[PDB]
């Protein structure tokens, strides 16, 4: 337990990536941008809402593990 206002949970529990408090910011795709590979598996959703057809990942439904796994 931490002395957090209104006993808010510290970790970023929102589905998109951020905290419950930071949930409106989750809608913004700024966080998603600046990442080397969209396809790389992280908490954030690989398919980007703004980029409809630009990504061209979902339409062909081709996932290459080797490409995303740089590490
Ligand atoms: Zn959110």
Domain ranges of the chain: 1-71
Elucidation technique: NMR
SS (H, E, C) 40-53: CCCCCCCCCCCCCC
Name the residues around ion ligand 1, CB cutoff 5 A: 14, 16, 23, 26
| Of residues 64, 67, 65, 35, the one with CA closest to residue 51 | 35
| Of residues 43, 45, 49, the one with CA closest to residue 19 | 43
> Is there a binding annotation on residue 54?
yes
Distance, CA 11 to ligand 1 centroid (Å)? Answer: 14
Residues 23 and 17: beta-carbon distance below 8 Å? no
Q: Residue 26: how many CA atoms within 13 Å on its side-chain side?
A: 16
> Is there a binding annotation on residue 26?
yes
Residues 68 and 39: beta-carbon distance below 8 Å? yes
DSSP 2-71: ---GGG---S---SSSS-STTHHHHHSSTTTTT-S-TTS-SSS-SS-SS-TTTS-STTTT---HHHH---
> Is there a binding annotation on residue 19?
no
> Is there a binding annotation on residue 52?
yes
Number of Cβ within a 10 Å radius of residue 59: 9
């Amino acid at each position: 337990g931490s002395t957090a206002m209104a006993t808010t949970m510290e970790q970023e529990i929102c589905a998109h990536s951020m905290t419950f408090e930071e949930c409106p910011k989750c809608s913004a795709l700024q966080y998603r941008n600046g990442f080397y590979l969209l396809k790389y598996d992280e908490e954030w959703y690989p398919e980007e809402l703004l980029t409809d057809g630009e990504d061209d990942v979902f339409d062909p439904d081709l996932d290459m593990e080797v490409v995303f796994e740089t590490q």
